[PDB]
Write a protein that binds this ligand. Structure first.
Ligand code: CLR
Ligand code: CLR
Ligand code: CLR
Ligand code: CLR
Ligand code: CLR
Ligand code: CLR
Ligand code: CLR
Length: 566
């Protein structure tokens, strides 16, 4: 029904493929600054102002509800106040104000022009078109209110750095207001409002085509420039920097969306509860948008804490996408029939599987071209990577052959679950290898025996499950292919693997990092299995468990890519 979600994934792929192409183009010393600077000038001075002006001429203020605006603005203000007061309380008075001048802006100003707008357009085109007009009401008005406080704090920092007592508060406030008014967004929004008042909701044809041509390329050009502006800005930092960065990113992506949603339910008191639900979903989706590079521009202008802000913007840009996907899907689950839940879990499984598959072949190609697998413990890691690649490929093939052929279906199921159980064991097997390496014992490692074990017990388990189990082909999900017996064998496999990892627990640090991260997902799957078997009656909690289990099962390659990929 409402909230057509199938269009979200292609939009995310488009929006990140453009950024990736821009990044790699600059990376390979192909594009130089000259045209890149020209591209940035075109985006900032011509394309974005044209888009704002054309979308601001046609607004139809007479039927625009302001409850959403109040909710979003006050929630942003609440996060702003919380972060600002915490920064004032915590930061050392040496340069505390500087922090308070930029840090709370990081959690409030988003990239809702270049990134968020395509996403909401894909999500809300044929369902709620009017939501699209809210972005241009939310992004500038916030810049009206919250950011001038940041500028005046930065100016206080600059003044105390200069130690010039002659300057009064009037000068500082004036400089801050001059800085905030100088931005193109402010005065172009004002000009748009003035022209909307003047022309009585009419667009000149002589310039309408010019405005459309200038504004249509803005999204892509801005995405390409953003990709170009991330080539060499991420650098190693200290532990305190890492901690404060994690807190900032969690404030942006975890606190603000929840406050926005809750205040949306609080303020709004209209009927037709479906529209209230849609507004809440839209507010939460708007909360999770990334951080715009405008804050990085401000920091560079002020020449203070530039590297922290830049690195945070870069990292949050990438972190936004998976959170966006999982958030959209999990909010969409409650208003769905169980069979659509099965189809949805198949869709998310296929999507994560293809992306993780690309990551996995990239990592495997790097590893094989390294020729570093011939010594311990890299060959076992290669085996695990191959098992993950095969499970992803089997997931895609199973998605295609869910109701295509019979013998093909059983062979695909056998291959997929043999690879799945192979990864389940190979976690604990790597744990054993690491533990025996910890012993520092000059004893030969049965490499042939250990590999044949790791690749032979899972196949034997699947085979005995097939022999003893009963075929049940009416279940969409692959877990319920055979029934209780498959759940029992998966549960005992998980329990054995977790026991092995717990008893057990040269780049050993990365290996132990992987041999710690995989096991949280191991407990997740085990808990889901025992939840299903013990709780025969369905409670209102296993849906998120199923979604998380599917995510881990088919995207576990991302952990290996992150650790053993650079
Ligand atoms: C970095 C590069 C190599 C990534 C390439 C990703 C490609 C192969 C991915 C990204 C989006 C994907 C598509 C997303 C959705 C669908 C609809 C589905 O019903 C059939 C598969 C199909 C049509 C996918 C085919 C593969 C696809 C085009
Ligand atoms: C539903 C899930 C998958 C959504 C995403 C959650 C996870 C993957 C996200 C949420 C916050 C993220 C962290 C935020 C900040 C940092 C600090 C940076 O210096 C390294 C990455 C790191 C440590 C991120 C790793 C990935 C992370 C833990
Ligand atoms: C499919 C969903 C659920 C998960 C997607 C995988 C996520 C969690 C992974 C895939 C690649 C990962 C990134 C790989 C490399 C880096 C650079 C590092 O300096 C900081 C962390 C960061 C930025 C990682 C953050 C987490 C990350 C984005
Ligand atoms: C997860 C689904 C739903 C959305 C798609 C997200 C994709 C496009 C994202 C998730 C994590 C991202 C990666 C995170 C970190 C890095 C390292 C950096 O040096 C190059 C880009 C690269 C390799 C990113 C490429 C794009 C990426 C793979
Ligand atoms: C019917 C109503 C009440 C359902 C409400 C579901 C809420 C509580 C769920 C749905 C989506 C969820 C989010 C999905 C993904 C992430 C990213 C993770 O790194 C931190 C938690 C966070 C941010 C979740 C917080 C809780 C969340 C907002
Ligand atoms: C499809 C999804 C998973 C995105 C995949 C992105 C990852 C796997 C790949 C795609 C293109 C890759 C980049 C291609 C070229 C280079 C230049 C080289 O000198 C360093 C590595 C670097 C910078 C690669 C990093 C990893 C990379 C970003
Ligand atoms: C499906 C979802 C839940 C997968 C989430 C994967 C997360 C936990 C993974 C993916 C990429 C990983 C990062 C990759 C690289 C590094 C650099 C290393 O020096 C410290 C760990 C760190 C920072 C990893 C932390 C964990 C990490 C963020």
């Amino acid at each position: 029904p409402s909230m057509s979600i199938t269009r979200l994934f292609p939009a995310l792929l488009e929006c990140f493929g453009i950024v990736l192409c821009g990044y790699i183009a600059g990376r390979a010393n192909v594009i130089t600054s000259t045209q890149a600077k020209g591209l940035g000038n075109f985006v900032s001075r011509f394309a974005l102002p044209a888009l704002l002006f054309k979308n601001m001429v046609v607004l139809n203020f007479s039927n625009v509800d302001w409850s959403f605006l109040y909710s979003i603005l006050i929630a942003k203000a609440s996060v702003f106040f919380i972060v600002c007061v915490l920064t004032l309380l915590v930061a050392s008075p040496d340069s505390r104000f500087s922090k308070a001048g930029l840090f709370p802006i990081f959690a409030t100003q988003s990239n809702d022009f270049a990134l968020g707008y395509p996403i909401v357009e894909a999500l809300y085109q044929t369902t709620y078109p009017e939501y699209l007009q809210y972005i241009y009401l939310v992004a500038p008005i916030s810049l009206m209110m919250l950011n001038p406080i940041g500028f005046i704090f930065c100016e206080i920092q600059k003044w105390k750095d200069t130690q010039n007592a002659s300057q009064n508060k009037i000068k500082i406030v004036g400089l801050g207001l001059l800085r905030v008014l100088q931005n193109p967004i402010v005065f172009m929004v004002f000009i748009g409002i003035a022209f909307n008042f003047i022309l009585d909701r009419k667009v000149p044809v002589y310039v309408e085509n010019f405005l459309d041509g200038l504004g249509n390329s803005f999204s892509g050009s801005a995405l390409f420039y953003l990709g170009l502006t991330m080539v060499g800005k991420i650098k190693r930092l200290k532990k305190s920097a890492f901690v404060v960065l994690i807190l900032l990113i969690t404030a942006k992506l975890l606190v603000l969306p929840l406050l926005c949603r809750e205040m949306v339910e609080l303020l709004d008191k209209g009927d037709s509860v479906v529209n209230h639900t849609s507004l809440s979903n839209y507010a939460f989706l708007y909360g999770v948008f990334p951080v715009a590079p405008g804050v990085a521009i401000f920091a560079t202008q002020f020449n203070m804490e530039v590297e922290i802000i830049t690195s945070g913007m870069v990292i949050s840009t990438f972190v936004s996408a998976p959170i966006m996907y999982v958030s959209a899907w999990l909010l969409t689950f409650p208003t769905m029939d169980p069979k659509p839940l099965a189809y949805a879990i198949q869709n998310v499984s296929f999507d994560i599987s293809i992306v993780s598959l690309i990551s996995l072949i990239w990592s495997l190609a790097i590893l094989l071209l390294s020729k570093k697998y011939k010594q311990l413990p890299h060959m076992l890691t290669t085996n695990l990577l191959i098992a993950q690649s095969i499970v992803c490929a089997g997931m895609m093939i199973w998605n295609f052959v869910k109701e295509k052929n019979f013998v093909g279906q059983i062979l695909v199921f056998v291959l997929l679950y043999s690879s799945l159980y192979s990864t389940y064991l190979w976690t604990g097997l790597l744990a054993i290898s690491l533990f025996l390496l910890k012993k520092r014992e000059r004893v030969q490692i049965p490499v042939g025996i250990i590999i044949i074990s790791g690749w032979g017990i899972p196949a034997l388990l699947v085979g005995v499950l097939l022999i003893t189990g009963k075929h049940n082909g009416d279940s969409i999900d692959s877990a319920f292919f055979y029934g209780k017996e498959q759940m029992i064998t998966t549960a005992v496999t998980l329990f054995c693997s977790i026991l092995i990892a717990g008893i057990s627990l040269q780049q050993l640090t990365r290996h132990v990092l992987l041999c710690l991260l995989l096991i949280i997902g191991l407990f997740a799957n085990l808990s889901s299995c025992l939840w299903w078997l013990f709780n025969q009656e369905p409670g209102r909690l296993y849906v998120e468990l199923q979604f998380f289990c599917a995510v881990f099962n088919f995207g576990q390659g991302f952990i290996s890519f992150g650790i053993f990929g650079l």
